[PDB]
């Protein structure tokens, strides 16, 4: 039972990380599919250019929560790589705040929203760059939390 | 010791849908009628929620994608209830396209579509709340499938 609790501890860390991973996946989704779009009766989403303000307000709000989840994440083994993700998170949110002149208006252009939250866009000058590092810093954390769990369930057949 | 991990898969897949749903909550409760402010983060910007509504629709389509990929004979009736709940939600927003399919969506209209705790739920919020509980019902049943089999350790 000495490990029965350490396997449970390792898996709590994983679940918290996977939640952070999923919310980031939602920023990815709206950046790739909702920028320059409006709801449509039959097609689901139709073209509607250059009013991405409320959408980017949503991206900022999802990123507030990601930062909040990462600050609540605590584990001694993965301390360095939690804080690495945390600093990537705070760097992303601070970047969006910094470009408030282009992102803090109802009429956020399509091109500028892509530079903020579309991590695969050709230009990344308004947040997309920092967002990509956030994605990578979380998958370094996820790849490791999984190894922590795997190292414990391992201990039952050797 | 792998049906134990086979039902882990369905639990992790449901947890992901649950997290995607939590993001629609966040933007509904904190992004409607808001804009990016340098000092405050979010400040007031009323009645231009069309793009934020499009993101909510896109997250919802993704949710529907995830649930359609969930295959397990054990929870299949609860998965199908979740699937139908999702499709009914998405179809409601498109039904209300006249109010939500435009750039200048009013704050009131937006809260009536994606803020499940709003007093009036006429444009989607009602179906959203049922979507949440549908996934909750599935999450509990998934958390029973692994827990009853993980009981094999000490029973």
């Amino acid at each position: 039972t000495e490990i029965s609790k350490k396997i449970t501890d390792s898996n709590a860390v994983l679940l918290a990380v996977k939640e952070v991973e999923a919310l980031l996946s939602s920023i990815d989704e709206i950046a790739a599919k909702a920028i320059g779009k409006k709801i449509h009766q039959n097609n689901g989403l139709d073209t509607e250019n250059n009013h991405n303000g409320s959408l980017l307000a949503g991206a900022y709000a999802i990123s507030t929560l990601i930062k909040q989840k990462l600050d609540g994440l605590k584990n001694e083994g993965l301390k360095e790589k939690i804080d690495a993700a945390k600093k990537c998170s705070e760097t992303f949110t601070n970047k969006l705040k910094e470009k408030h002149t282009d992102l803090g208006k109802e009429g956020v252009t399509d091109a500028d929203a892509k530079e903020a939250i579309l991590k695969t866009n050709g230009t990344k000058t308004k947040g997309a760059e920092e967002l990509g590092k956030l994605f990578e810093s979380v998958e370094v954390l996820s790849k490791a939390a999984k190894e922590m769990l795997a190292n414990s369930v391992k201990e039952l057949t050797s | 010791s792998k049906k134990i991990t086979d039902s882990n898969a369905v639990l992790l897949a449901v947890k992901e849908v649950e997290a995607l749903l939590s993001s629609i909550d966040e933007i509904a409760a904190k992004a409607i009628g808001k804009k990016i402010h340098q000092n405050n983060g979010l400040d007031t910007e009323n009645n231009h929620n069309g793009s934020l509504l499009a993101g909510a629709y896109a997250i919802s389509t993704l949710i529907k994608q995830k649930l359609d990929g969930l295959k397990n004979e054990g929870l299949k009736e609860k998965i199908d209830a979740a699937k139908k709940c999702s499709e009914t939600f998405t179809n409601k927003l498109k039904e209300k396209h006249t109010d939500l399919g435009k750039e200048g969506v009013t704050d009131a209209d937006a809260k009536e579509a994606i803020l499940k705790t709003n007093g009036t739920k006429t444009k989607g919020a009602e179906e959203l709340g049922k979507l949440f509980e549908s996934v909750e019902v599935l999450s509990k049943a998934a958390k029973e499938m692994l827990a009853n089999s993980v009981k094999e350790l000490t029973s």
Partner: antibody
Amino acid sequence: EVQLEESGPEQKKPGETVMMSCKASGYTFTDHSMHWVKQAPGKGLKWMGWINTETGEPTCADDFKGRFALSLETSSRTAFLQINNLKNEDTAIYFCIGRWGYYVYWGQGTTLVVSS
Amino acid sequence: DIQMTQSPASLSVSVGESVTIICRASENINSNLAWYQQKQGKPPQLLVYAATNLAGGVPSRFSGSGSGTQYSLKINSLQSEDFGTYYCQHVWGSPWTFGGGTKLEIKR
């Protein structure tokens, strides 16, 4: 929407023990918790603790344990607050709260009077 | 933990005038703030949740504002039904601590 209904009013004397209940119905609490609140006469609202509606694990403020005990019956969605060796300062209205989304659901309160 | 301080302690405001109370958290709480009105001898009534959204049955003359650590509730034109003690609450994780309250009397 979530509805919370609590026990009837209670009158005890110093030394006895009381148990209150709070039954939840409607949607699930999005964070799977029920929080207890105490309001002594003339004082504000004070947070006491919370219980995990999945595990039954209690968590309390330092002001409230070694004495207060919190349990939950999952089948009936019913939280329980039991206080032992009651003292005059336990006289308060005790509320039971919880959230769906960011909306907090309340009421109606249980009134406890510890007195001779 | 994150303490919540309310201000002012009390106000006496006439009908038709405006009212603003302040809630300040000791750390950033991410707009996870509720506002309550409580009349003497009744349970508190939720007015605002997640910092800005009105609760059920709450009139449009109420509003919530603020971010980070500073938040406020405003009544732009005060009606005589609005006397009471007003409380803020941090609503996230645990604990869900309360402000000290603000007693609002209607001047007359």
